[PDB]
Each structure stands twice: as structure tokens, then as C-alpha cells.
Subunit: 113 residues, 8 copies
């Protein structure tokens, strides 16, 4: 139930306070931004790379402090990846998925990892 | 059967002689100290992060030398984490758990990792 | 002479083919994007952090293969940092500086680092 | 101007939001805590090690994003190290130095490294 | 169906644009090159080591971005390692296996890792 | 069937040509050397630490090039660790076990890792 | 005085017994191989990248054990880099320089790093 | 003043309580042990590599906590390296130098790094 940024770009309200994580989030917004303009293989691949890399890195930082809610978080990550690997062109869904994942799921680890 | 420090702060008698481990132990004492003053979600979270991170790191150092009693040690770690993840406000228990874990369990790896 | 993206966001034409670098570049465009909306300390600070980090990381990568034109490149980096640290509110110049630095200066290290 | 903690221990108001930094800061408070009780070589050594390590690590993190006020910060660090290396037993000064260094100098790098 | 280089050495048409991967690929060509001249134990071992190392490293980089087609790729890697470990002297097969693997299988991860 | 050095110390005939491995092997001879003079808990602990660490490190290097005979090698390592963790005082057996392990089992990975 | 490989490719007689180094050397031979066929910017770039990286990595390894003849070695590296950066098309000189650098200069660090 | 071990081998009395350091110290005793038997280039080089690496590594550990007596310690290291690089065969001096360096100079950093 959060606003979908237009243009679809990362903004400080999505800040987790983990500099590296925030920078990775910036890439995810950009990847979706282009996918909305030109929904092709190249743009999907850019997003897919940045997404797989971010999710893995974020998982590693969560594991570094044995984050209590890692298991549920990882399943969320898997659902988005699955959606990108069986891409049906729903850019609006992806836009809202990333917004909600960061503000509701990623925010849960604030001060815990 | 060891005395519970008052104020609850790390002291040299808890020294394992592994500088990094000793520095991480200092954070667990500080975490329980505040939890005892204000037993809220923020302080539990600080203790939780430091505890999850310390246990993981300490486990990595033990596995680096294939510590003989790694398994039983890891089981102790799991018990405290589980207690913190199902916190019922028994600070006195946590205070004694940490003191005893370090002096009886952690001290077992002295010179072995 | 290169067109200035509007909205000011990274796009594939800026690709250096170095995954890490391209992702860091996406963060610089986003930094300038918000600076253009609200020219305040927080927005400049975000850009300043990402810029300082990216330039250093890029320099380290260039140094890793003893990049031939490292010195000239470093001097360019210093100028942007200096501008950011003696900020006068010229967002138009910053937008132009980044676009031209990546496409003429960064592109020069393609296949050399 | 800030209150000197009693007992002299780290607390959440000193939070910089960098987990490694906050954890290292906890070790410095503890180091000074014991110095005040027993002003001896061993207690000074513990603080000296934790202080030398923390300052170096924090400096490296500031350098990682080419922190704008690194030089002034480094000069502050050298002043404290110098006092520790030419110790005259002024624990009251040390207690105040650390409190003020974190809240006025360290707090300056928030969101920039 | 690609041409088998003669002499059997790495050339720019095999470029993946990942510097470290391309440099490891150069060692595989050199390995097969000598096995073709003197199909003995020492040359098989040199190739085996560089192949074992490259496949592992490439696999790590693929996992770094959770490469979508990692499983089928690892199965390919396994097939060649299996061949090298039960070596019967079919140099011509090894020559075409490497050429085809890089150009059809490795090329699939371009821009994805 | 190799000679058992007397004094029990590492010598160049044990060289694998991997500087770090050779250095770790030197610690193993020294550990057994003292265990022969004073077969106590401290000396067994020293050897055990260096042994667990060397075996893990050596296993990591073997895995780095997916060493062909890793499995059988690891089984040998486990046998010596098991003997140290269920120590019955057979110093002569440990002396010959190490000498033979390096010269017949470790030597197998020469040029392959 | 050493024979110049033809085709110009690395061979076991150039082995230093350092896995990483030898693998890097293989890239240098391949780089000069193509330069000899087509003396252009891309081929010189590929060799320049690999040469800069190798020389740096080798220097780091030499420094790791504080190699006694590091200075004389570094000077030789600078001479080759200088040549590549002020390229005049003398592929024959480059072929001979690399062969002789490895067999007379690199071989000097055998067993010392 | 300290007794020179015979056989010249590391023993527990030389313990600094830093695992890595202690293991590296074991390689230095072994290096000198063989030099005393056969004072040749191969034995001097083994010791030299080990000594150079140990000294550098120990210096890196000292610097990590900005060890207070780092300069005086580095000067000692250089003294020994110089002797090894201008070797005149005084094994007796070398045996005494290492023993005294560890027990008087190295011991000074106990609990400080
Ligand atoms: Cl995200
Ligand atoms: Cl603990
Ligand atoms: Cl840039
Ligand atoms: Cl501080
Ligand atoms: Cl390949
Ligand atoms: Cl062994
Ligand atoms: Cl070379
Ligand atoms: Cl020493």
C-alpha cells in the first residue's frame, strides 16, 4: 500500500541505512524502469543479474548476524526470481513487488544485520 | 557457579585470548545490560544481532581448526538464540547463561582454534 | 555533445561491460536525479558517498591491470569530487559532467581492466 | 556538553548506524570503564588495542567513500592515541574525549560512508 | 559447428567480456594444445588443474548473480571433468568440446553474471 | 616405508612445492615432536589445532582445482583426526602416519592444485 | 639464448611451480601471439591488460615474502610496460623479452615466494 | 640469556598466544635447524622466504591495532633480513637472534594486537 514512484527510480524513503544494500536497491529500480519502456531480453537480463546478485548479497548479510526472519525473507526472494525466470511481461506487478518487498520485508532487518 | 558482574559488563576474567572474540563478547554484555534496564524490542534486537553475529563468527573460527567439540558448542549457541527469539523477559537467566557459556563452554576452545 | 538523459537515469548506452562499475554508475545518476529536485545536504551527501566510493573502486580496478591512462583519469575524478565538496548548485553541469565522464573517460578503459 | 555515562558504558544514543562501528565503540567504553577502576598497564593495553584497531578500521571505512572530512577526523584519532601512549591517568578526560568524539566527530560521517 | 583453431590457441572470437574468465579460458586452450602434441600424464594434469579451477571459479561467478541456467551449465562442466578423469586420449573430441562449450554454453551467461 | 626423521622435524624431502602447505606441514612435525616427549593435553591440543587447520586448508586448496582424488584424501584426514580425538598415546604410529601421508597421499596432488 | 616458441605459446619448460603465475604467463604468450598476426589496438590492449595484471600480481606475491631481488625485478617489469605503452611494432623483441624474463628473472624467485 | 633449544625447534615457551604467529614461528626454527646442518642456498632460501613472510605478516597484525612499538619492532626485523641477505654462516648468532627476538621483542605485543 505504498506509492509507486514515477519515474520508477529509487528514493530515500526506501533507505535501509545499509549503504551497500541501498545502492543495490537503486539498480533494481533502474532495471525495472527500462523493462517498462522496452520489455526485451536484454533489459530483463540486466534486472535479472542485479536481482540475483542483490538477493544473494542481502541473504549473506542477513546470515552474517543469523537474522531471525531469514527463511521467510528468502522465500520472498525466490518468488520474484521465479517471476523473472518465467517472465510474462507484468511490469506493473514487478514495480509494486519491489516497492512492497523493500518497505515491508527488507525494512524488517533494520538494525538487525 | 561464577559471579554475575554488577554492573553487567565484560571484564578481563572472561578473556579467551582471542582479541576479536573478546571484543564480540564485550558487545553481548552491553546488550544484556540495556535489556535489563529497558526490556524492549530495540534492545533485544541489538543483543540479538550481536549474538547472531558473534555465534556465527566464533563458529567459523572453530571450524577453521576443526574444533573437536564444535557440535555441542553449536547446540549451546542454538539454545540462547532460540531463547532470544522466544523472549519471555528472563534477564537474570540470560545474564547467567552468558557468564557460564563463556567461562565453561567458550573457555574449552582456548588454544585449540 | 552526448544527450542528457531525461529523466536523469542510467541507461544501457552507458554500459562499460563491467558489472560492478555499471551498477555503481546507476547510483550516480540516481544521486544527481534527486539533487536536481531538492538541492539539499542529504541529497548531496548521498551522491557524495556513492561518488567517492565508485571513483575509489574504479581506481582500484584500473590499478589492478596498471591501466595506462590512470593518472589522467584520477585527475578527472578529483575535479568532480572537488565540485561536490564546493557545491554551488549547478545541477546542469553535474548532469553533463557524469554523462561525458562515462562516455569519453570511462569508456577508454574498456577491455583494459 | 553531553552527559558522561555512569556506569561508563555504550548506549543507543551513541549509534552511528554502522553495525561494525557501533560494536567497536562498545569495546572502547568498556576499556575506559576498567581503566577508571584499576589504572594499570593491562587495562590500558586492552583499551589501546581496541582504540588502535577501531580508529584504523573506521579510517578505512571513511576512506572507502573518500570521506570529505577524513583529515580532520584522523587528527582527532592521533590526539587520543597520543594521550594513551603518554598516559598520565586522567580517566575523566578520556571518558569525556570518547563521548564527545563519537557524538560530534563520528556522527559527522553518518550517511556518508 | 564452429571452426577448431589451428594452432589450438585462444583467440578474441571466444571473448566473454569477463577478463578473468577469458584469461582462464586461455589456459584451457594451452592445455589441450600440448596434450595434442604429447598426450601424457603431465600434460593431462596441467589441463585437469586449469579445468578444475576454471570450472569452479566460473561456477562461483555464475552463483554470484544466481545465474538462471547454472544447473545445466554445471552438468556440462561435470561431463568434461569426467572425461578428463577417465582419459582415453580423444584429443579431437576435447578440442571440439572446449570450442563448443565456450561459444554455445559460456556465451549464454554474457551480461548475466 | 619412508624413514622416520630423528629428531622428528620437517625436512626438504617432504616438500610439495606449495609454500603454505609446506609451512603447515612443519607445524605438524613440531606438534608430534613434543607429544613424544610429553604426551599431555596441551601438546595434543597444539597438534590437534594445527592438524585440523592444515587439513581444512589443504582440503580447500584441493577443492580450488576440484582435485580428482579429493574424496579418498579427505577420508585419510578424517582417520588421523579421529585418532587424535581418541588418543591412546601411540606416538610412533602418529610419527609414521604423518610421514607416509605427506609422501604418498599429499604428494599425489603435486602440480594438480 | 633460449628458443623462441613457434607457435608462440607457453610450454612446461617455463613452469615456475606457482599455479597462479604460470596461468598468468600463459595469457602473456597468447597476447603476443595475436599481436604478431595483427598488430592492432585491441590485441595490444589484451596483452597490456594481462601484462599489467600479471606484473602487479607477481609483484604482490614477491612482496608477500619480502623477495630479496624485488627491486631489480620491478624495474624489468616497468621496462616491458613502457615498451607496450610506446609500441613500435617489434613483435620479435617482445617474443624474446618475455621468454628471457621468465627463464632468467622469474625463475630467480623459485622457492622464495 | 635464554637457553638455545637443542634440537633447535619451536617449543611452548615461545608461545605468543596468536595461533598464526606461533605457527609461523615454528617454520623459522625449522629453517635455522637445517641451515646449521647444511649451510646452503636451498636451506637459506627456505628460511628467508619463511622469515620474510612471517615478518611481513606479523607487521600487518601489529599495524591492525596500530601497535605502539611498531617502528622499533620493524627495525629488528630488518636487522635479521639484512643478515640473511648478506649471509656469512653464523648459525650460532641466528639461533640466538630468533630466540631473543621472540621472547623479548615479540612478547611485547602480547595482548596488544
Ligand atoms: Cl530489494
Ligand atoms: Cl558468548
Ligand atoms: Cl562515472
Ligand atoms: Cl570512537
Ligand atoms: Cl571453458
Ligand atoms: Cl599433512
Ligand atoms: Cl612474465
Ligand atoms: Cl620471529
Amino acid at each position: 500500500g505504498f506509492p509507486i514512484p514515477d519515474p520508477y527510480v529509487w528514493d530515500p524513503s526506501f533507505r535501509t541505512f545499509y549503504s551497500i544494500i541501498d545502492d543495490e536497491h537503486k539498480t533494481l529500480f533502474n532495471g525495472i524502469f527500462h523493462l517498462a519502456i522496452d520489455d526485451n531480453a536484454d533489459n530483463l537480463g540486466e534486472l535479472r543479474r542485479c536481482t540475483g546478485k542483490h538477493f544473494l548479497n542481502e541473504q549473506v548479510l542477513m546470515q552474517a548476524s543469523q537474522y531471525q526472519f531469514y527463511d521467510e525473507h528468502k522465500k520472498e526472494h525466490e518468488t520474484f526470481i521465479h517471476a523473472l525466470d518465467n517472465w510474462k511481461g507484468d511490469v506493473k506487478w514487478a514495480k509494486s513487488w519491489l516497492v512492497n518487498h523493500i518497505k515491508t520485508i527488507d525494512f524488517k532487518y533494520k538494525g538487525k544485520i
